[PDB]
């Protein structure tokens, strides 16, 4: 529907049958989840944020449900402070920024 | 506008008569600009995210134009990789997330 930004835009996600909380993040290119175990092939990547860089594992074609919307795509896993849903998946689920 | 998220949401900002570019970041609580000279008193803060924390300076009641919408608010200044408009000022200009 329509999300205020008076508070953090947090939504429940479901990934591999687990429920997680995550932040709808227009300032993130990619979706980055806190450390967790996923199946299949991965490649190591370095991503930047506000305070510097972190190592993550990239996993492709992972099914995620974000606030009721089924998505499938790339998930980075690493020491992010909060689970983040970035533009790759926001675009998949039809999310725009309006004002 | 209804800004789409196929590309980083970079927008025109105007502050103190200077034209800059900033990223609309729903993942940021507050607005943080690259090093620049602003008027008035300020206080040191730390802000954190991926990669850890950086030291910034906080200025109050700073007028800023974001996509032609006028805002006035707290602006942090410090070594962010990119100018960032956070939720503080996204709220003032009327921003919502819509899926």
């Amino acid at each position: 529907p329509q999300i205020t930004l008076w508070k953090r835009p947090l939504v429940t996600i479901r990934i591999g049958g687990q429920l997680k909380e995550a932040l709808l993040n227009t300032g993130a290119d990619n979706t980055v989840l806190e450390e967790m175990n996923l199946p299949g092939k991965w490649k190591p990547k370095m991503i930047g944020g506000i305070g510097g860089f972190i190592k993550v594992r990239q996993y492709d074609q992972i099914p995620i449900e974000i606030c009721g919307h089924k998505a499938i795509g790339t998930v980075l896993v690493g020491p992010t402070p909060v689970n983040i849903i970035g533009r790759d998946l926001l675009t998949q689920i039809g999310c725009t920024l309006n004002f | 506008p209804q800004i789409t998220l196929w590309k980083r949401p970079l927008v025109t900002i105007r502050i103190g008569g200077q034209l800059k570019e900033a990223l609309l970041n729903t993942g940021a609580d507050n607005t943080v600009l690259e090093e620049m000279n602003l008027p008035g008193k300020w206080k040191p803060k730390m802000i954190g995210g991926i990669g850890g924390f950086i030291k910034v300076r906080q200025y109050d009641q700073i007028p800023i134009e974001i996509c032609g919408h006028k805002a006035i608010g707290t602006v942090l200044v410090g070594p962010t990789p990119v100018n960032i408009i956070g939720r503080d000022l996204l709220t003032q200009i009327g921003c919502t997330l819509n899926f």
Binding site: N25, G27, I47, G48 | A28, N30, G48, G49, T80, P81
Partner: peptide, 10 residues
């Protein structure tokens, strides 16, 4: 608690 979750691809 951290509050700025800028993130940029490799």
């Amino acid at each position: 608690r951290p509050g700025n979750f800028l993130q940029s691809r490799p």
